[PDB]
Each structure stands twice: as structure tokens, then as C-alpha cells.
Amino acid sequence: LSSSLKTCYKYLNQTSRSFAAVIQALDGEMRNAVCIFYLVLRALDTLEDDMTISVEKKVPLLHNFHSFLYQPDWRFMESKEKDRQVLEDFPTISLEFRNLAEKYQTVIADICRRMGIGMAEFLDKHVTSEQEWDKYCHYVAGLVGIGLSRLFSASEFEDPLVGEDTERANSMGLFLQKTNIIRDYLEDQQGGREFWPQEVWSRYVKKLGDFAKPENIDLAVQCLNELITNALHHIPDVITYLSRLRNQSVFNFCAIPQVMAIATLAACYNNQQVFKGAVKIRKGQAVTLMMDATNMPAVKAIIYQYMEEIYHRIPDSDPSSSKTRQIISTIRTQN
Ligand SMILES: COc1cccc([C@H]2O[C@H](CC(=O)N3CCC(CC(=O)O)CC3)c3cccn3-c3ccc(Cl)cc32)c1OC
């Protein structure tokens, strides 16, 4: 491997940790394609996330990021974030992007252009409606799902339907993103970040930060349950998406995050701790999930056991109780 590609995989291990191994297991040309897409997305997210970068500087950065892929000298030295090396050494990453077959470069570049437009749109608004939540998640995660799917089909390891069905790929991203947004309430609150949809939380409290106060914990948990029930709606599409995959290494890459989000939603459901700290699945639990998630019967079994767990925890008085039961019933009966 070239020095530059070695450096890319080092950044992948620094930035994705135990997830790097799953990416390194991808067959043939998919391996480098996904490694570089992952790093390019890390760089874009670092720019987006950086509250030290003014809106006037950030908008052109987000809008033009797709072009930087083609600018050998482009770098960004002013980031204060944790993964800033990918920005400071962007020339090494973009060199390797330019070394990919053009069919992969063109996927990545298009996705970055579209994601940048959307990210820029959300700099001067919080999320209002559930529809706006889906739009926000499309921009930061659904389009990742779409991009990856196109790499899978373009590499010919998966059927063209995988790349073309934007809605199923979109749902892969939305599921993950909403699970993270839900679980991360408190850390976001403390960071000055608000991603829970205003249309939903404003039905319980006056300000989103009110859920951190002990007197509102019943209302906070009801809102949590409502948002979780929303995220569960993506599961049918996740099942459909995963069921079409014929390459083992692609399957494992796609399935791993999905089963870990499933377990995380189960851990968070009706859980007051969401408002006191970071609820996480245990490392040994995550390792088993990762090892198990290698075929459809196995993944469906996992989904079913965690959905059943949530089903039996639904408080009768929960405002979303009938909605939660219905989505769980739908999931259990399709497969
Ligand atoms: C078809 O679409 C995907 C297939 C596989 C993975 C992803 C997605 O997974 C991570 C999930 C994730 O990062 N984690 C952390 C590590 C975990 C595994 C471990 O602990 O080792 C799984 C969940 C994620 C969440 C939100 C955005 N992404 C994302 C960014 C970039 C790429 Cl290339 C792919 C992803 C996909 O994007 C939706």
C-alpha cells in the first residue's frame, strides 16, 4: 500500500475504532472506496459540527466541499474538533479519493455536494416538524446510506436495486441517526445542541432543556417513548434492505450498526437514565451482536427479541402505547 493509503487506514482506525475492522473486511474495491468515503464524511461532519467556524465561513465550506475533493492542495487548518487531523491532512485523503475508480469518486462527490447543501440549510434553524426531522436526518445520514448503496452496486458486488432504492437506503441512515439523536439528548443539551423535533417535545414542555429537570421526568420519558416509536417505523425498510444483500462482507458491514441501534433503542425505551446520562449497551453485548449479525434469520431473531422486550415494557398509560404496539405488530408479521 502507498504511504498515503496507509495513512488513510490509520485515520480510519483512529476515527472509527472497532468499526474499522468491519470496513477492512469488505471485498475487493469496496474496501478502499468505503474507507475513503468514511474519512471524507468525517471531514465534512467535523466542519459542520465546529461551533468555532462562523456561519459566513461555514456556508461556502459546506457548499464547496465536494469541489475540494478535486483540489490537491486543499486543507483546513482552523478546526478545534477531535478529528481535525482528517481536515489538516485532507490532501492525503483527497489524493486517495482521486485514486479510486471514477465510478466511485462520482458517487462520493455527488453525495458530498447534496449533503453540503442540506447541512448549510440547517445552520440557522432547529428541527421543527417530524417531517423536518426526516429532512435533517436525510442530509446527515440518509444520504450516507444512499452513497454506500451506490458503491455496493457500482462495484458489482450487489444487484443494481441496492444502489437504486434510495428510500430503503435512506431508512438505513434515518434509523441510526434517530437512535443516536434520541440516546444523546443530555450530552447534546449540555453542548448547546438541540435535535429533538420541536413539534414533538413542545407537546410536553416549554423548552427542550426542561427534560433535564427532575420535576419533568415523567413528561421527558413520554416524549422519549414517542420518539422511539417514530424511529421504529424504519425497521420494515431496514429488514427489506438487509434481505437483498448477497455479499457477506457487505451484509456484515450493513447489519452491524442496525442490530446495535435496535439494542440501544431497547435499552433507552421508558428509561429515565436517558435524562441523567449516556445509556450505552455493554461492550460484551455489542461484541456478541456483531458476531451474530451475519445472516437474515439471525438478524430478524435479534430484532424480534428486542422488539418483544420493548413490547412487554410499554406502560398502559403511555400516550404512544397503541402506536408502539402497532409498529411492533407490523414488524413481527412481515417476516
Ligand atoms: C448502507 O448504509 C450503511 C451501512 C453501514 C454503515 C452505515 C453507517 O454506520 C454508522 C454506524 C457507526 O458509526 N457506529 C459506530 C461503530 C459500531 C460498531 C462497533 O462498535 O465496532 C456501529 C455503529 C453511522 C451512523 C450514522 C452515520 N453513519 C455512517 C457514517 C459513515 C459510513 Cl461510511 C457509514 C455509516 C451506513 O449508513 C447508513
Closest CA relative to residue 264, chosen from 187, 169, 181: 181
**Cα distance between residue 283 and residue 294, in whole Å:** 18
Closest CA relative to residue 92, chosen from 29, 156, 8: 8
| Identity of the residue numbered 66 | H
Give 173 Cα–ligand 1 centroid separation in angstroms.
8
To which residue does cell 404496539 refer? 325
CB atoms within 10 A of CB 24: 15
**Cα distance between residue 268 and residue 196, in whole Å:** 15
Closest CA relative to residue 34, chosen from 134, 149, 137: 149
Q: Which three cell numbers stand for residue 94?
A: 483527497
The b-or-e profile of 139-163 (16+ CB within 10 A means b, else e) is: bbbbbbbbbbbbbbbbbebbeeebb
Atom number in ligand 1 closest to CA 23: 33
Q: Which residues are CB-neighbours of 39 under 8 A, at least 6 positions away?
A: 8, 11, 12, 15, 86, 93
Closest CA relative to residue 144, chosen from 177, 96, 120: 177
**Cα distance between residue 267 and residue 247, in whole Å:** 30
What Cα–Cα distance (Å) separates residue 127 from each residue in 22, 168, 237? Answer: 33, 23, 23
Resolution of the structure in the document, Å: 1.8
Please, are residues 82 and 11 in contact by the beta-carbon 8 Å criterion? no
Minimum CA distance residue for ligand 1 atom 36: 145
| Whether the CB of 147 sits within 6 Å of ligand 1 | no
**Cα distance between residue 69 and residue 174, in whole Å:** 26
Q: Does 31 qualify as catalytic in the annotation?
A: no
DSSP classification of residue 277: S
Rounded to 10°, the helix 90-99/102-121 angle is: 130
Q: Does 183 qualify as catalytic in the annotation?
A: yes
Q: Which residues are CB-neighbours of 231 under 8 A, at least 6 positions away?
A: 174, 175, 178, 179, 182, 265
% helix, strand, coil for the chain, step of 5:
75, 0, 25
Please, are residues 263 and 257 in contact by the beta-carbon 8 Å criterion? no
Minimum CA distance residue for ligand 1 atom 6: 254
Helices (H), 196-335: 198-201, 217-232, 235-243, 248-268, 283-292, 296-313, 321-334
Q: How many alpha carbons fall within 13 Å on the CB side of residue 285? A: 13
Give 142 Cα–ligand 1 centroid separation in angstroms.
11
Q: Does 11 qualify as catalytic in the annotation?
A: no
Mutate to test the pocket of ligand 1, among 148, 177, 235, 291 (most ligand atoms within 8 A of CB): 148
Q: How many residues does the chain have?
A: 335
Please, are residues 26 and 114 in contact by the beta-carbon 8 Å criterion? no
Element (DSSP H or E) covering residue 98: helix 90-99
Minimum CA distance residue for ligand 1 atom 2: 145
Helices (H) and strands (E) in the chain, counts: 19, 0
Q: In terms of CATH architecture, what is 1-335?
A: Orthogonal Bundle (1.10)
Tell me phi and psi for residue 194, to 5 degrees: -130, 110
Minimum CA distance residue for ligand 1 atom 22: 257
| Identity of the residue numbered 85 | Q
Question: Residue 49 annotated as binding?
Answer: yes
**Cα distance between residue 97 and residue 108, in whole Å:** 9
Please, are residues 263 and 289 in contact by the beta-carbon 8 Å criterion? yes
Please, are residues 218 and 212 in contact by the beta-carbon 8 Å criterion? no
Question: Residue 98 annotated as binding?
Answer: no
Question: Residue 42 annotated as binding?
Answer: yes
**Cα distance between residue 63 and residue 83, in whole Å:** 20
To which residue does cell 479510486 refer? 100
**Cα distance between residue 150 and residue 161, in whole Å:** 9
| Whether the CB of 327 sits within 6 Å of ligand 1 | no
Name the residue ranges covered by the structural domains of the chain: 1-335
Q: Which three cell numbers stand for residue 197?
A: 423535533
Burial class (CB in 10 A: 0-12, 13-18, 19+), 53: buried
Closest CA relative to residue 192, chosen from 177, 208, 213: 208
Give 13 Cα–ligand 1 centroid separation in angstroms.
14
Question: Residue 187 annotated as binding?
Answer: no
Q: DSSP labels for 125-168?
A: ----SHHHHHHHHIIIIIHHHHHHHHHHHHTTSS-HHHHH-HHH
The b-or-e profile of 293-332 (16+ CB within 10 A means b, else e) is: beebeebbebbeebbeebeeebeeebbbeebbeebbeebe
**Method of elucidation:** X-ray
In a 3-state reduction of DSSP, which class is residue 223?
helix
Question: Residue 83 annotated as binding?
Answer: no
Minimum CA distance residue for ligand 1 atom 32: 38
